[PDB]
Enzyme design. Structure first.
Site: not given
Ligand SMILES: *[C@@H]1O[C@H](CO)[C@@H](O[C@@H]2O[C@H](CO)[C@@H](O)[C@H](O)[C@H]2NC(C)=O)[C@H](O)[C@H]1NC(C)=O
Ligand SMILES: *[C@@H]1O[C@H](CO)[C@@H](O[C@@H]2O[C@H](CO)[C@@H](O)[C@H](O)[C@H]2NC(C)=O)[C@H](O)[C@H]1NC(C)=O
Ligand code: MG
Lengths: 507, 512
Positions: A18, A20-21, A82
């Protein structure tokens, strides 16, 4: 015909897991390598702990080498949430003996999420950003907060400035530090623009300005949940930064992208010429991103974009300002190795039907389209009077993207529901219909310029040389690929296509 | 099968012709009559000139008598564009002898659009708002602009011993400006401020209105000012939209308390909101809006009328934030209908302590107009993770053809409420690609320790409104079933059994 196992070829995806950012974006000038990290769950194709920074490298922002997990939380409970990268040329951290090239002193500033505490750590790399060593035993900035994430740090001349989200209070905190270790609070930007549910992923940046002054500061602020189409969106503010405070020129709300699948934009700490501002974004939306029908990887990234401030307004009788986006790809290699089709001075009409069949289709194309509305006596306000381009596909021509323009709605449309994939029908937040209010390029001619990129499951539409941009994902059936572009309109001679280049990418 | 001839019963629609934005809204306290005016073309079901102000009157803001064309431009080519109505109590206009009741001294302030000009005119009525007379054979506020429209006027009481003035809010549309002019007498106007480039500019500012609104403070004043600005084109969903700012008016300048952008309605078909000049209580603030979107409105499948209006709503400023860890402020919206008459002339249904598992409601003698209330909560489930659609849906099916239905519900992975309005046979809904099939709203809980979602719906034939968290969030949308196919059954479904629990579900069909 249940999953959409077509994988982008010029948008970066993880090999598996996965994604995601975007994280730690930086440019290594000695190796001439672009570094893209991302939030990554290697164990599955849905968000989960432990969460790492995946790491990928590119010579040309088109082709990616995905090395997988690199920066980690330190326990199964936690997340390397993040964060950003910086190049500590002058060795302010003091992590770097003379043997580390100044151009590679990569320090990473990142959020640890563990239980109820989100706090910022730093970790330097001594191998050009491939592994990382945690600074001390603890964090460098903890405020006993559960929602305290997404540090984006730049050098201001001089000190380091950090922008962090105190997300739940809709605040970008700004902090300074001489050395990346001792951080002191400096200003609390709060309750601006479209607030939605949280502030996520701030980043402050100085951007060139093509007037008609030289530069302007821009704050990016991502929003999830609560965006106006649903779920995530990215907004920006235009203003000035006094060394401690960010002051927006105006009270306007500005979105970076008018599509549903563009979020968590971050900018590269540096670029080769040290002036251009490049940045990339995660190409999905939080409402349906973990249910996307792809395997064995899930999220995709947008193209890299160049952001420049331009004088622009949405009508010919006023003056405003907008972040122009130009797409960064390796177009020399991509257009050399690829096959072009084109049309000219074509007055769309049923009698003279026109279409483009793509030789040996690949699913990755670009196009420029230049059209005008001539009008017809038979068009009025109670008919749908559209110029449509159906991008139909090779193995099942009932799966198509339908994109185009209609007068009576004065807008451009994207229909992305025509596919056999169940997900697109079953998930009710994957909107079939999307719209963008695309300005003409010249108000004495009323010529519309669209430039679009299609890559298997994602399409990006750049209107008016990049003043308006819309990014969305589609899902064809597996090994179904766009092989026929079909031009239609129920009103003859109503529209005219000046120009329509296609260029299939052979990849 | 082509045209959806179901006319709304508690929302106002003209007898025939094309209807557009609400205009000149006022309240007659003498006769106790609500007056609504509308942009109107009687010669077709599409916009065209000459445009008039159609006129409607109502006792309860629920049933309306349509009187047709009342204010006109005086020429074929021209148009009588939007405007507002003021009650000139102390006859500051010099138009009213004392035989005209003060409560009835009605002056319309409106835009004349003719050829390339758009300028503000005033007309006035001597029969309580049915017939009007233009004043002076010239405009009262011209600025040789082609985009100068939609004046909304109110009275500003001067403090200390200063007299007080009329305040006009107008749209210098293309430059994204609400101009604030004052007047002593509705005739000589003077520029006071230029509110420019705020919020969601889109393509044009339209239909501005400054208002002062009560404030239910439960925080850490009594009132606050609200500015309504309508945007079209360029709404985020595409087409038209209505935003508002919260702040103060110092007599010349509107000054917002932040640079936030707040949408009045998250749906696709809520535009051009106007507030009534005055209410019975002299303190409550009521507004009506046009219930369509400019992108597809003149294509809607209705005959011989094209547009509908929304319910009047009562606007009150409350303390609200979208998460439990912050403060902010929101315009709460509360429907305003003759609920006593409607509910007692009509049929109720209930459901309690219900936990959803693989229940339906049949409406008796369906009228197509109904209200409903819903309290639901999510329980979790071993079988629900991030990669599934774990929805609680409610299908409002149709009696004559039940393959046409509204599907509205909640889903946990998207944390939001959805409405699907594509499922119908009406070609318009498939053919016009700006008529979104799927609409969403990030609706909050109403208590952050119980996690109970509250949703109040109103479904009149061909239009549905939804209010969330007691009206902190509102989404309005049109839908179109086949001719004579009103809502007949509501079936509650979920693919994960025991995942959701419907605490309450009060439906009440209106037999109107
Ligand atoms: C109110 O302010 C706006 C915005 O500052 C003014 O708009 C300008 O109008 C001219 C035409 O006269 C345009 O060419 C400019 O581009 C507009 N400026 C901007 C920033 O868009 C407007 O004229 C003002 N109106 C009054 C009555 O003062
Ligand atoms: C930055 O400003 C925000 C906005 O005022 C502050 O938010 C408050 O935080 C407390 C708890 O920390 C909440 O209970 C309040 O509701 C918040 N206020 C609002 C308006 O939402 C925030 O604390 C400030 N942070 C710093 C570090 O200065
Ligand atoms: Mg109008």
């Amino acid at each position: 015909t249940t999953f959409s196992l077509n994988r982008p070829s010029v948008h970066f995806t993880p090999s598996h897991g996965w994604m995601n950012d975007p994280n730690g974006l930086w440019y290594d000038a000695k190796e001439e390598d672009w570094h893209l990290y991302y939030q990554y769950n290697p164990a599955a194709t849905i968000w989960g702990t432990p969460l790492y920074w995946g790491h990928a490298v590119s010579k040309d922002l088109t082709s990616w080498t995905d090395y997988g997990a690199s920066l980690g939380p330190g326990s199964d409970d936690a997340g390397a949430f993040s964060g950003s990268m910086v190049i500590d040329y002058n060795n302010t951290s003091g992590f770097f003996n003379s043997s580390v090239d100044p151009r590679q002193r990569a320090v990473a500033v990142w959020t640890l999420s563990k239980g109820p505490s989100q706090a910022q750590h730093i970790s330097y790399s001594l191998d050009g950003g491939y592994t990382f060593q945690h600074y001390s035993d603890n964090a460098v900035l903890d405020i006993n907060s559960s929602n305290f994430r997404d540090p984006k740090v730049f050098w201001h001349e001089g000190r380091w400035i950090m922008a962090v989200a105190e997300s739940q209070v809709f605040s970008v905190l700004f902090y300074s530090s001489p050395n990346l270790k001792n951080w002191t609070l400096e200003s609390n930007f709060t309750h601006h623009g479209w607030t939605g549910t949280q502030y996520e992923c701030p980043g402050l940046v100085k951007v060139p300005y093509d007037s008609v002054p030289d530069s302007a500061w821009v704050l990016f602020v991502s929003i999830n949940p609560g965006g106006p189409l649903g779920g995530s969106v990215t907004q920006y503010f235009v203003g000035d930064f006094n060394g401690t405070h960010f002051t927006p020129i105006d009270d306007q709300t500005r979105f970076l992208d008018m599509g549903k699948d563009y979020y968590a934009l971050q900018t590269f700490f540096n670029t080769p010429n040290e002036k251009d501002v490049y940045g990339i974004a995660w190409a999905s939306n939080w409402q349906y991103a973990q249910q996307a029908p792809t395997d064995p990887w899930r999220s995709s990234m947008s193209l890299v974009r160049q952001f420049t401030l331009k004088d622009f307004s949405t009508n010919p009788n006023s003056a405003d300002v907008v972040l122009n986006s130009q797409p960064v790809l390796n177009y020399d290699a991509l257009r050399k190795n690829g096959t072009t089709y084109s049309i000219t001075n074509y007055t769309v009409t049923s009698e003279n039907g026109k279409k483009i069949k793509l030789d040996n289709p690949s699913g990755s194309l670009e196009f420029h389209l230049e059209y005008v509305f001539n009008g017809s006596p038979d068009i009025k306000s109670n008919v749908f009077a559209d110029l449509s381009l159906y991008f139909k596909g090779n193995n099942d021509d009932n799966e198509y993207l339908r994109l185009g323009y209609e007068t009576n709605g004065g807008a451009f449309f994207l229909d992305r529901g025509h596919t056999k994939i169940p997900f697109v029908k079953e998930n009710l937040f994957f909107n079939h219909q999307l719209a963008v209010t695309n300005p003409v390029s010249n108000y004495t001619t009323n010529v519309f310029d669209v430039y679009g990129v299609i890559d298997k499951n994602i399409i990006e539409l750049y209107f008016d040389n990049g003043n308006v941009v819309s990014t969305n994902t589609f899902f064809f059936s597996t090994n179904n690929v766009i092989g026929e572009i079909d031009i239609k309109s129920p009103y003859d001679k109503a529209y005219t296509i000046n120009s329509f280049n296609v260029t299939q990418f052979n990849v």
